[PDB]
Design a protein around this ligand. Structure first.
Ligand SMILES: O=C(O)c1ccccc1-c1c2ccc(=O)cc-2oc2cc(O)ccc12
Length: 231
């Protein structure tokens, strides 16, 4: 039932100045009943956090050069990069947010912002069985019009969406990944423009960098992440 996002190729070697093309396919249509197709492309530079380059298939995040273009429809999507430069090098991910759970492709290795801020705190080291509360304080966007999420990253599983807390128009509904159901609880406070993640009964496999994200009208902003180690 979970939408599988498949990227090709896993690794894409290029020479500076060449054109690059990355494919992302979904296991089912990403066309939403509301008319939007919720497909994002991200770039993660080595050692840094993922940043959105393209949203709703083809919309370029302002600031991203015109050399980048997203295209496609339904289940078949493509990111094109003209005249590759050094700053473009890193891992590109696609993600779908039409269906819950939100899901990510496995990545392809190619080898401010209106004052928006999201700051994650609470990370650290705990032993299995332990608990930890992550907090995310935001500013620079009208929080009431955003769905807040927690997404995590590990070498073993890649990017994984784990929880969502919708806004008032969408009944403040919460959703969780099966991997954390019954253990993690996402909470939201509009007055403080903050979201929190209470993580109980932690396991080694919960180890990862945890990012808070704010999504609205197909766009998404992400924090720099906070590291959680369960050892
Ligand atoms: O896209 C929207 O209409 C919308 C507006 C405000 C807040 C969230 C959404 C939004 C969705 C609203 C309804 C729905 O059925 C699905 C939505 O999906 C989204 C996916 C995103 O990445 C990012 C945003 C959304």
């Amino acid at each position: 039932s979970d939408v599988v996002m498949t990227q090709t190729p896993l690794s894409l070697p290029v020479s500076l100045g060449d054109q690059a093309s990355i494919s992302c396919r979904s296991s089912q249509s990403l066309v939403h009943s509301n008319g939007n197709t919720y497909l994002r492309w991200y770039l993660q530079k080595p050692g840094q956090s993922p940043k959105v380059l393209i949203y709703k298939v083809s919309n370029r995040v302002s600031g991203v050069p015109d050399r980048f273009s997203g295209s496609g429809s339904g289940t078949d999507f493509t990111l094109k990069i003209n005249r590759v430069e050094a700053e473009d090098l890193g891992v590109y991910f696609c993600s779908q947010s039409t269906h819950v759970p939100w899901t990510f492709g496995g990545g392809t290795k190619l080898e401010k912002d209106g004052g928006v801020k999201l700051d994650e705190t609470g990370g650290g080291l705990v032993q299995p069985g332990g608990a930890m509360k992550l907090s995310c304080v935001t500013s620079g966007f009208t929080f009431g019009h955003y769905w807040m999420n927690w997404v995590r990253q590990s070498p073993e599983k890649g990017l994984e969406w784990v929880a969502q807390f919708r806004n008032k128009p969408y009944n403040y509904e919460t959703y969780y990944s099966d991997s954390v159901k019954g253990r993690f609880t996402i909470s939201r406070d509009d007055s403080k423009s903050s979201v929190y993640l209470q993580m109980n009964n932690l396991r080694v496999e919960d180890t990862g960098i945890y990012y808070c994200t704010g999504a609205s009208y197909g766009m998404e902003y992400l924090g720099q992440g906070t590291s959680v180690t369960v050892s």
